[PDB]
Design a protein around this ligand. Structure first.
Ligand SMILES: Nc1nc2c(ncn2[C@@H]2O[C@H](COP(=O)(O)OP(=O)(O)OP(=O)(O)O)[C@@H](O)[C@H]2O)c(=O)[nH]1
Ligand SMILES: Nc1nc2c(ncn2[C@@H]2O[C@H](COP(=O)(O)OP(=O)(O)OP(=O)(O)O)[C@@H](O)[C@H]2O)c(=O)[nH]1
Ligand SMILES: [Mg+2]
Ligand SMILES: [Mg+2]
Ligand code: NA
Ligand code: NA
Ligand code: NA
Ligand code: NA
Ligand code: NA
Lengths: 171, 171
RNA sequence: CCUG
RNA sequence: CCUG
């Protein structure tokens, strides 16, 4: 059992490479409206979830949605890679503005697992160098997450640990 | 600040080398009866907090006290090094027996800091090899703490982070 | 210091 | 994929 305790008013930031299973995990554990996805936001602004050139607009939209949810006291899960500190920073700031608890859930999986999953995907794929970079960035990020402002930091170190997760929401 | 959230019913396990500041930290944040110290227990059984030969008796007494407190629903802080998995295991089990949440607070400080603190102590000192070993064991322990059963894992990565700590005890 |  |  991998029990992850979170407050009812949480901003849950998923941290993981492309192919690490973030979207699958979010669908398993949360309501669809609780999950806001950066790729979905690329689709909202451009019709194309794969379009990297609309990244700025997509994240502007994602951040705006997060802010409205937290204003209204609604638990929110950010489904994006979040492997760069510069990506996490504005999310921590929004949580701070609305007195919300930021939670980090890190998919600390071997690069090989993510590359294999990516190779077999039919929906969307990235190049191998992208997953190599994401995995390196994820690993470098782990130590400093608490200091960034994550009040709960949960690291999942294998697919077996990921599969075992159950969230306990505390009111 | 470094806010560490803990439930009202917690077993707080301090993890750190001799010289890492565990006892000083414990008295800043918790009342005296909330803190049970392994060295104090060596004193209870033998008159000598330094005596390594009475370690079995001392931990038998400490575990018994912890069990009585958790049975009565009283928050308890374990002031011992807790750098070996075999030392943490019985503590996790006692917490489980009494439906208490185990919390890890790790003093991830450089060996050098602990060594210099140790040299300037007038109350009690250990040999250099002891602190070198404890620091290695502490660092090797960090990754696996969640999987051992610690429901919250807090790592303090510098004296500055230690100084910023505020416990938020949740009703 | 759960005992080099 | 917060854009080699
Ligand atoms: N066995 C198993 N496979 C998984 C799991 N999660 C994801 N996968 C596989 O990995 C592929 C990618 O999963 P996603 O959930 O889309 O991964 P992601 O982290 O959202 O990837 P990006 O959206 O590109 O960042 C899926 O199509 C699955 O085949 C899992 O929990 N268990
Ligand atoms: N500057 C500074 N010194 C500290 C701090 N905490 C503890 N010290 C000093 O470090 C020395 C050791 O501190 P303790 O609190 O006894 O450390 P410990 O982890 O309990 O050590 P053991 O009981 O041998 O395991 C003492 O002389 C303290 O005054 C701190 O936060 N800042
Ligand atoms: Mg996805
Ligand atoms: Mg002490
Ligand atoms: Na923009
Ligand atoms: Na792509
Ligand atoms: Na890599
Ligand atoms: Na494991
Ligand atoms: Na260990």
């Amino acid at each position: 059992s991998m029990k992850l305790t979170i407050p009812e008013l949480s901003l849950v930031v998923l941290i993981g490479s492309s192919g690490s299973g973030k979207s699958t995990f979010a669908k398993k554990h949360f309501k669809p409206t609780e999950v806001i996805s950066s790729n979905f936001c690329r689709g909202l602004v451009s019709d194309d979830e794969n379009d990297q050139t609309v990244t700025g607009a997509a994240f502007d939209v994602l951040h705006y949605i997060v802010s409205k949810r937290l204003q209204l006291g609604k638990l929110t899960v950010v489904d994006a890679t979040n492997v760069q500190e510069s990506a996490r920073k504005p999310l921590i700031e929004i949580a701070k503005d609305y007195h919300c608890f930021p939670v980090a859930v890190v998919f600390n999986l071997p690069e090989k697992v993510c590359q294999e999953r990516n190779k077999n995907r039919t929906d969307r794929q990235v190049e191998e160098y992208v997953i190599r970079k994401h995995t390196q960035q994820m690993k470098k990020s782990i130590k400093g997450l608490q200091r960034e402002g994550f009040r709960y930091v949960y690291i999942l170190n294998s697919p077996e640990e990921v599969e075992e997760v159950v969230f306990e929401r505390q009111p």
